[PDB]
């Protein structure tokens, strides 16, 4: 478990239907919302690949060994019942294990992709801002809507505001 | 200025079972156990042959109720509950093995 | 059209598990006794 979905992000954004991992900003212009394409597409592709590998099954042909309209010998019938009930229990246990493990892995994979996008945005905002902890980024100088898109487009340059941030933090 | 990060959620979540939590809430999920079937025998694309009141043994011995099914070809043989095998009363030795051999066959 | 059958009729599904009957003929999924098994297709839901 990573500290993103069940950790420092103590609240989800139900109003963010644009994607699974998006940005919400508040600048002098006002409040705005967008979504990151890369992480959302990665999660969607992984989940769809899981589902695709899951739903495919050739299911080798089987035939009837027990008669439905006549009586079977008692001993061989008991043997068949025992075998089929054992197979049922085995498949039930494997189904439980597969479902539980796959759900855990899907949730933790969404969490990992969230944290990876977080680290990407941090590597972009390397030396011009600070992270308050609750998923937000306390920008120390400013950021325009075009600056926000540059953060989305992964084109934000920190050497352009480095000296500005240093002078604002010192004075 | 300020920019925050977060994930989405839904009002009516779906409960799933995991290795650490029996009841974990997620978004729209999918059921994996089928619980409903079709009360029909879909035979489109299958050269079926309904025996009706005819029993597999009657096809080999030639009972009246199997006069319509003494010979033929099929990829799926369908047996019914009222399948009559003997017009004259009697029994068959190793009837289960012969019935399996006939139901597994695709023609006589 | 179908590819799986049992005493009560046909089975047309893409799921790997079913809880109708352990006796099935053809290319069928495996019978399980669990009434329901939900697979997660999303992350943790954190309400507001």
């Amino acid at each position: 478990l990573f500290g993103a979905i069940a950790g420092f992000l103590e609240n989800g954004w139900e109003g963010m239907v644009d994607g699974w991992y998006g940005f919400r900003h508040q600048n002098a212009q006002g409040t705005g919302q967008a979504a990151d394409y890369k992480s959302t597409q990665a999660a969607i592709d992984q989940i769809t690949g899981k589902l695709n590998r899951l739903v495919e099954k050739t299911n080798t042909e089987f035939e009837s060994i027990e008669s439905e309209f006549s009586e079977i010998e008692h001993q061989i019938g008991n043997v068949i019942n025992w075998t089929k009930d054992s197979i049922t229990d085995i498949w039930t246990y494997q189904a439980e294990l597969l479902v539980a493990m796959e759900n855990q892995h899907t949730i933790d994979m969404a969490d990992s992709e969230m944290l990876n996008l977080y680290e990407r945005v941090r590597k972009q905002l390397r030396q011009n801002a600070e992270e308050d902890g609750k998923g937000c980024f306390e920008i120390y100088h400013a950021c325009d809507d075009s600056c926000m898109e540059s953060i989305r487009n992964n084109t934000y340059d920190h050497s352009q505001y480095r000296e500005e941030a240093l002078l604002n933090r010192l004075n | 200025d300020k920019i925050c990060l977060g994930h989405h959620a839904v009002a009516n979540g779906t409960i799933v079972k995991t290795l650490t939590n029996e009841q974990e809430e997620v978004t729209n999920a999918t059921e994996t156990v089928e619980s409903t079937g079709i009360n029909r025998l879909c035979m489109k694309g299958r050269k079926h042959k309904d025996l009706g009141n005819c029993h597999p043994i009657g096809m080999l011995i030639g009972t009246p109720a199997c006069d319509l099914h003494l010979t033929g070809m099929w990829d799926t043989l369908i047996e019914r509950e009222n399948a009559i095998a003997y017009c004259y009363p009697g029994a068959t030795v190793n009837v289960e093995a012969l019935r399996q051999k006939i139901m597994e066959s695709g023609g006589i | 059209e179908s590819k799986c059958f049992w005493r009560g009729g046909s089975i047309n599904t893409r799921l790997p598990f079913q809880n109708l009957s352990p006796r099935t003929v053809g290319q069928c999924p495996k019978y399980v006794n669990r009434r329901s098994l939900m697979l997660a297709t999303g992350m943790r839901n954190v309400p507001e």
Partner: nanobody
């Protein structure tokens, strides 16, 4: 399920405008983002236009950018395309179809699915000449 209707075909002279319109049924059209593609006679595939499920952005192809216009209406479940100045490079078969596209061009309802709703229906075969 897979049943459609297409209109706008015929013989249009060069210089005038072509207007094509396809309407599908058997599913919820108001969610799938649709695409218009063209194929010149013989072989060769060239994409024309894409549209969001609500019509937010078009992002036309550079070959016909600023010259064509794609639009959609979810009430009547229809997708239309209008193009002007039809040179000989526009005589082709125009397919309206649902292709695997970016996720936000589709709706949140079909993200969690491995169905991959497939399409491409029939053709139109627009021709421009005397």
């Amino acid at each position: 399920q897979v049943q459609l209707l297409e209109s706008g075909g015929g013989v249009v002279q060069p210089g005038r405008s072509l207007r094509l319109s396809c309407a599908a049924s058997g599913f919820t059209f108001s969610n799938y983002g649709m695409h218009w593609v063209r194929q010149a006679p013989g072989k060769g595939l060239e994409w024309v236009a894409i549209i969001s499920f609500d019509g937010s952005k078009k992002y036309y192809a550079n070959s016909v950018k600023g010259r064509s216009t794609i639009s959609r209406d979810n009430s009547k479940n229809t997708l239309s395309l209008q193009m002007e100045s039809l040179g000989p490079e526009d005589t082709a078969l125009y397919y309206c179809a649902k292709l695997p596209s970016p996720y936000y061009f589709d709706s949140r309802f079909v993200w969690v699915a491995a169905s991959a709703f497939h399409f491409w229906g029939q053709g139109i075969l627009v021709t421009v000449s005397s």
